[PDB]
């Protein structure tokens, strides 16, 4: 959490000085850390999406049935 | 309405009569579109009863 906060505080100054989204290369050069750590932090730092989010503009069908069940096998392979 | 329409669809109509009949046509359309759901609710109730 502290590393994410430091990276965000650095990205805040980077965007204020440049005006564009902070590239991972410049962030890693300024942080003196490899790009793999920055990439992993940017990948993991994402809020999970809710399960009742509507797919469209109309609140008719939610995200209840929108994911396929790829865990169990199918009748084809069983047969 | 006190003043009715005198022409018909064969000789053509003006803007006034068309605009005065459109608000009744769409009124009936909205009425039947909203009652198509009350009818379904009534069918649901009648199926649940018997």
């Amino acid at each position: 959490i502290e590393t994410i906060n430091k990276l965000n505080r650095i990205s805040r100054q980077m965007l204020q000085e440049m005006g564009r989204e902070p590239t991972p290369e410049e962030l890693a050069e300024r942080m003196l850390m490899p790009e793999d750590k920055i990439r992993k932090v940017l990948k993991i730092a994402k809020e999970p999406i809710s399960m009742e989010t509507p797919i469209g503009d109309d609140e008719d069908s939610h995200l209840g049935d929108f994911i396929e069940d790829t865990t169990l096998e199918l009748p084809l392979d069983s047969a | 309405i006190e003043t009715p329409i005198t022409a018909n669809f064969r000789e053509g109509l003006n803007v006034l009569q068309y605009f005065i009949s459109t608000h009744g046509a769409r009124k009936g359309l909205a009425d039947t579109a909203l009652k198509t759901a009350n009818s379904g609710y009534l069918t649901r109730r009648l199926v649940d009863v018997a």
Partner: protein
């Protein structure tokens, strides 16, 4: 985690017969508890039919037991809803049981009154806060004595409102006694946990995670329970303990019925979470979405087509519908004759669309039922069964005469196609829901075929008359002569021509009576009588054939 929500030790393995650390391979090992992770090697469906529990520190009052009308808790305790609400939310104290003659059961005291009454007496004034007090009251109360008191009071007075109240209370008490339930079971000390499969946590295709609101609710409940335990283990002050208990009660409420007595808990972005009460009561709940009607295998939706191209009890279907639905039967009858090596090769042969595939599909579709549906299905005629025939063009054809049965005009609607698999269902669809067997409407004894079709208007025109123009002034022997005269291009179907009509009438026992005579009519009416079989009289067709006429 080894102590998380969906831990592998409590709810079983995640994968198919595989431990947590991936050490217990060789599925043969069944029911062996590991020493490192401790995961019972079983199937994945074990998580579906098992649940957990949470050990709470302080008991909680069930929200939906007193918030639901007519507040059965208040009826059994003879106390209004406002009082039990003030007691549960730690606003005022209540006396459980008073041994002295000062106060008795069901007496409310505020913060100042409780302090004034506590400094005077001691060791006998029993009073707790909310859930504990209600549990002690339900444990110390006696049902038989209260029932006897109510039955003795009802015999003396007969005030309508009070009599009905006491009668409902006696009914509730008798039901509770005969049900074998205990009053201590009303409180909640250990609440169950939803199975992990009902609250899934799988990564989305967009590289992100999809969480569940119920997981967040359970996490909040567990966090509040841990905070309450840490406060009780460290001797927290009275105000902090009351606030933590109120928060735990609110969390239990939101987990059971999220936000109906007050403000709902704010969700992820803007919308509040839905609880089990919303999954049970709401219109998008499980009842009217997964029990009554839901998605069904071996189905399809297609566009309508305008053309008979068949007979009454037959409909036209595109090659693909059976291209995707009859493939199990295709593979079965391929293994029957042995034209394919295995099922895996038969699938590829079907995917190549060979000629033998269609030759076998022609026999698969030979005398096979299929259910047609139009949404919505109001009356019985909305669900019928037919038999399909392979055609070109990927739109399903519909029978012309079932347009009034399905109540679906040919304006570009969508039809649903379903396929029965079992011989039982196939036979009950062939016999019961056939267009030939089900021809009348369930509303009245009249035929449901009340048709459109200016085509039928032209039939009526055939049954009409016209001027005496060229073609009138002859006599014909039978309807076939009139048919030939009209097809050869000699006269119209309006000529007043006497036809030698041989009419048949039923006998008194069931036989037929033959009689031939001349009838003044036209050519079109003679053709219509020819279309009529030898089982109907001629006096009905002798007039104009409109809508009500053909209906009769």
């Amino acid at each position: 985690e080894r102590d998380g929500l969906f831990c592998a030790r409590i709810f079983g393995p995640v994968k198919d017969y595989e431990c947590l650390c991936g050490k217990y391979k060789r599925l043969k090992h069944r029911g062996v508890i590991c020493e490192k992770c401790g995961v019972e090697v079983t199937q994945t469906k074990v998580r579906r039919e098992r649940m957990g529990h949470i050990e709470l520190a302080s008991p909680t009052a069930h929200i939906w037991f007193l918030k639901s009308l007519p507040s059965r808790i208040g009826l059994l305790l003879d106390m209004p809803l406002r009082d039990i609400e003030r007691v549960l939310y730690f606003e005022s104290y209540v006396v459980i049981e008073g041994g002295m003659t000062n106060l008795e059961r069901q007496q409310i005291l505020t913060e100042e009154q409780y302090l004034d009454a506590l400094e005077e007496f001691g060791d006998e004034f029993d009073a707790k806060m909310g859930a504990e007090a209600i549990q002690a009251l339900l444990k110390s109360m006696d049902l038989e004595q209260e029932c006897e008191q109510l039955r003795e009071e009802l015999n003396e007075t007969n005030s309508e409102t009070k009599r009905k109240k006491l009668t409902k209370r006696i009914k509730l008490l008798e039901a509770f006694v005969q049900s074998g339930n205990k009053p201590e079971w009303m409180i909640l000390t250990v609440l169950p946990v939803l199975p992990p499969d009902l609250r899934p946590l799988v990564p989305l295709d967009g590289g992100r995670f999809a969480t569940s609101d119920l997981n967040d609710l359970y996490r909040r409940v567990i966090n509040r329970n841990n905070r309450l335990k840490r406060l009780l283990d460290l001797a927290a002050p009275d105000i902090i303990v009351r606030n933590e208990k109120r928060m735990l009660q609110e969390a239990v409420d939101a987990l059971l019925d999220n936000g109906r007595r007050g403000r709902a808990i704010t969700g992820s972005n803007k919308r509040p979470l839905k609880s089990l009460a919303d999954m049970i009561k709401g219109k998008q709940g499980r009842f009217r979405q997964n029990l009554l009607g839901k998605r069904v295998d071996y189905s399809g939706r297609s566009v309508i087509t305008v053309g008979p191209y068949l007979r009454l009890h037959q409909c036209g279907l595109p090659k693909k519908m059976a291209l995707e639905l009859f493939k199990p039967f295709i593979y079965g009858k391929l293994e029957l004759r042995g034209l394919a090596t295995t099922i895996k090769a038969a699938k590829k042969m079907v995917e190549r669309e060979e000629a033998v595939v269609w030759d076998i599909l022609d026999e698969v579709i030979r005398e096979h039922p299929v259910l047609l549906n139009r949404a919505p299905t109001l009356h019985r005629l909305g669900i019928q069964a037919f038999e399909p025939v392979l055609i070109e063009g990927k739109a399903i054809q519909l029978h012309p005469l079932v347009c009034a049965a399905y109540n679906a005009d040919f304006d570009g609607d969508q039809m649903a196609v379903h396929v029965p698999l079992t011989l039982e269902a196939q036979l009950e669809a062939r016999a019961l829901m056939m267009s030939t067997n089900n021809i009348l409407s369930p509303a009245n004894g009249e035929p449901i075929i009340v048709p459109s079709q200016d085509v039928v208007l032209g039939l009526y025109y055939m049954t009409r008359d016209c001027v005496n123009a060229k073609g009138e002034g002859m006599v014909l022997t039978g309807p076939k002569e009139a048919e030939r005269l009209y097809r050869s291009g000699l006269a119209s179907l309006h000529a007043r021509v006497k036809v030698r009509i041989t009419e048949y009438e039923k006998d008194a026992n069931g036989e037929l009576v033959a009689k031939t005579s001349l009838k003044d009519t036209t050519v079109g009416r003679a053709i219509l009588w020819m279309i009529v079989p030898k089982g109907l009289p001629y006096s009905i067709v002798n007039q104009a054939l409109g809508k009500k006429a053909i209906s009769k």
